[PDB]
């Protein structure tokens, strides 16, 4: 009858899940950038 | 009613997960610091040997 | 808050919602079936359900073995772990005891049969059954077979065979003893007559006769004593722990039902569905939210509240039943008089039956729970017998009198000589008085029948239902022209012509493709008249059998007749009961002409909801 109930939880649930994907991606990217950059210094220092 | 709130019971499980993987994004970095570090302990000792060796040779030559 | 899930039908969406809304549950929102999908049980949930079934079944298994099964309404909340740990020692112990018991019983059954033959046979060739030099073969022969067998063996085996027999009370167990290597020949001879070798089951059969015979005698003596013990240990275990199993059974069953509920709701198998929320406090509160007339009415209120069609309350039924039902009892000499006594045995208690124990604690032929339900019924019977005693003096208006009829209140020879309900004028009016109620019921069903199509908003039912009621008027009209002739009923001889127009004139407005079938609508009218007539007249007939059962049917009547008639009277009682119980089914037979033909009633050819017969079973 009321379509309103089932619509408005579905599209709040969809946002919760997308927002889970967001902070998972925005983290793995970072961790690799940090590790890349640590070792760059370890090459910069090693030769010097 | 729980509707908007219905979604915060998931956002709390799926926040538990995301913290468990920011407890692995710390562990990974620990091991990688302990790796990067050890590659320069080997760098330190091997050079030290080659400097002990270079002055000893140059003394026997002298 | 606790999340709660609700279902109902589409038809009652508003009525269900209003009721739930009131009950405790708050924040009710509707959910369509596409929303319910994707909330089917996860594999873990299905494993709990599988396991809950095992516990349910597993109890039924243990509890049946141990003795009798009983299903209470008392569960005991426990874990998966707690319920399975409860169940495992008792099922094991009981399984073990029943197995011994079966072996003990089979052994007895064989040993009881075959001890006497093996004793006889062993005796005949004593100490020669374990020799290699001689071969023995046991076999049974009847008196009839013995000569044939002997001939056959004698020709086959010459005169160097030994045929011996010894009796046992009936036939003879016979033994033929033959040389080793003459075995095949010996066998062949038995086989041609159709007689074959006797060998028992297991080790005994294979043992020498002498061993087998000694051991069988021992088993018959030992078994009955050990059987007694195993049966005793098993009885104690039931006695102490039959309850434990029963309480697991109930609890386990509730959990199975809950998880099944969620799988059905999940596949979108309930059309109207709600979600709402209850605080922990509200959770109980949701589940929480003259005797003859009042008493059945208060239980019927549960059916007031759930309608299903354009139908009205199923409650007009009960006061139509009661006058007509009481008036099937009309005796006063050994019919209603005897029947008074019957009432007390169902509304009190007896022990004069075996399957029935004491009713006061709810123990009858009927299941113990069903017996507690039919207290109400038993009362409604008690009220019928009581009122029938009054309508037995109503009958005695038409019998007893000291001047109007030729039979006193109690003659001094024997009570009741000749019935005086054989006056022609007297029988006709009691039949015509009875007919009047049947007519009242014809109007009441078809008037509701029309109101049904008005508020169910199908004009085809409205139009058909109105028209058929015109025919009643014609039916009665026509009768008056014959009951009063032209002295009375010349006041309806001209309305009848027009009454006939009304029967057809409204029915045709719906059209209808079987106009003849209207004949059968007129059939239903006719029945209410005939059944009420049968209800009086057949009721009165009940009394007139009692003429020859507790009334003068010996000599000219005298002092001796009083205690002489009772020979025929007792024989007459069971005969009398059977035909008068046949009349008491008329109230329901009447009701069903109208009830299942949707005359302000729920039913109409099938459809869920019980016949009133089954409703009134408990009420």
UniProtKB/Swiss-Prot annotation, chain B:
Parent-record interval covered: 3 to 64 of 188
One GO CC annotation: proton-transporting two-sector ATPase complex, catalytic domain
Family indicated by similarity: Belongs to the V-ATPase E subunit family.
Transmembrane segment boundaries: none
UniProt key word Lipoprotein: no
Function: Produces ATP from ADP in the presence of a proton gradient across the membrane.
The protein, known as: V-type ATP synthase subunit E
Coiled-coil regions, chain positions: none
GO BP terms, alphabetized: proton motive force-driven plasma membrane ATP synthesis
Gene name as annotated: atpE
GO molecular function per UniProt: ATP binding; proton-transporting ATP synthase activity, rotational mechanism; proton-transporting ATPase activity, rotational mechanism
Organism listed in the record: Thermus thermophilus (strain ATCC 27634 / DSM 579 / HB8)
Keyword vocabulary terms for this entry: ATP synthesis, Hydrogen ion transport, Ion transport, Transport
């Amino acid at each position: 009858g009321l379509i309103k109930s089932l619509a408005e939880k579905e599209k709040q649930l969809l946002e919760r899940l997308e927002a889970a994907k967001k902070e998972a991606e925005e983290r793995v990217k970072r961790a690799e950038a940090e590790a890349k950059a640590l070792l760059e210094e370890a090459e910069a220092k090693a030769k010097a | 009613k729980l509707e908007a709130i219905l979604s915060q019971e998931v956002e709390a499980e799926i926040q538990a997960l995301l913290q468990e993987a920011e407890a692995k994004a710390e562990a990974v970095k620990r091991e990688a610091e302990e790796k990067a570090k050890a590659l320069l302990q080997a760098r330190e000792r091997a050079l030290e040997a080659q400097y002990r060796a270079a002055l000893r040779r140059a003394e026997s030559a002298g | 808050m606790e999340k709660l899930v609700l279902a109902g039908p589409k038809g009652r969406a508003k009525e269900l919602l209003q009721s739930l809304q009131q009950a405790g549950v708050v924040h009710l929102e509707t959910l369509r079936p596409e929303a319910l999908s994707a909330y089917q049980l996860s594999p873990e949930e299905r494993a709990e359900l599988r396991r809950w079934e095992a516990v349910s079944a597993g109890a039924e298994h243990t509890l049946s073995l141990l003795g009798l099964e009983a299903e209470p309404a008392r569960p005991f909340p426990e874990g998966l772990e707690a319920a399975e740990k409860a169940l495992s020692p008792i099922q094991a112990h009981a399984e073990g005891l029943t197995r011994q018991k079966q072996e003990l019983e089979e052994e007895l059954a064989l040993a009881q049969a075959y001890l006497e033959p093996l004793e006889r046979l062993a005796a005949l060739a004593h100490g020669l059954d374990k020799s290699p030099f001689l071969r023995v073969i046991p076999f049974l022969l009847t008196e009839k077979e013995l000569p044939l067998v002997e001939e056959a063996l004698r020709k086959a085996l010459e005169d160097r065979y030994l045929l011996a027999h010894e009796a046992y009370a009936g036939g003879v167990p016979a033994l033929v003893v033959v040389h080793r290597k003459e075995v095949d020949q010996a066998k062949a001879a038995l086989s041609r007559a159709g007689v074959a070798e006797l060998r028992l089951p297991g080790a005994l059969g294979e043992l020498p006769l002498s061993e087998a015979a000694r051991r069988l005698k021992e088993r018959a003596e030992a078994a009955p004593r050990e059987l007694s013990e195993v049966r005793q240990h098993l009885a104690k275990l039931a006695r102490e722990s039959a309850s434990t199993l029963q309480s697991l059974w109930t609890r386990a069953q509730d959990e199975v039902a809950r998880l099944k509920a969620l799988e059905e709701l999940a596949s979108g198998r309930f059309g109207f569905a709600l979600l709402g929320y209850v605080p922990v406090k509200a959770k109980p509160k949701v589940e929480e939210a003259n005797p003859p007339w009042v008493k059945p009415f208060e239980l019927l209120v549960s059916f007031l509240n759930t309608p299903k069609y354009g139908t009205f309350d199923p409650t007009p039924v009960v006061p139509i039943f009661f006058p007509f039902w009481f008036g099937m009892i009309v005796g006063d000499i050994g019919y209603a008089l005897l029947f008074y006594l019957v009432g007390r045995w169902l509304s009190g208690y007896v022990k004069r039956n075996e399957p029935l124990v004491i009713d006061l604690f709810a123990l009858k032929l009927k299941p113990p729970v069903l017996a507690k339900l039919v207290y109400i019924l038993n009362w409604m019977v008690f009220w019928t017998v009581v009122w029938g005693l009054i309508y037995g003096e109503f009958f005695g208006t038409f019998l007893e009198h000291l001047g109007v009829f030729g039979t006193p209140e109690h003659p001094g020879l024997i009570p009741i000589l000749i019935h005086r309900i054989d006056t022609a004028k007297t029988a006709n009016l009691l039949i015509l008085l009875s007919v009047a109620f049947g007519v009242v019921m014809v109007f009441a069903g078809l008037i509701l029948r029309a109101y049904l199509g008005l508020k169910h908003r199908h004009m085809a039912h409205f139009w058909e239902g109105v028209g058929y009621l015109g025919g009643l008027l014609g039916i009665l009209a026509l009768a008056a022209s014959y009951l009063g002739n032209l002295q009375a009923g010349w006041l309806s001889a001209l309305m009848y012509l027009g009454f006939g127009v009304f029967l057809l004139s409204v029915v045709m407005s719906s059209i209808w493709l079987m106009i003849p079938e209207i004949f059968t609508q007129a059939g239903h009218i006719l029945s209410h008249i005939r059944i009420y007539a049968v209800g009086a007249a057949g009721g009165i007939l009940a009394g007139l059998l009692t003429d020859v059962g507790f009334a003068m049917a010996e000599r000219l009547g005298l002092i001796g007749v009083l205690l002489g008639i009772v020979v025929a009277g007792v024989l007459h009682l069971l005969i009398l009961l059977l035909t008068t119980l046949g009349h008491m089914l008329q109230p329901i037979r009447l009701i069903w002409v109208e009830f299942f033909t949707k005359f302000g009633f729920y039913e109409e050819n099938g459809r869920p909801y019980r016949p009133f017969k089954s409703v009134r079973e408990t009420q």
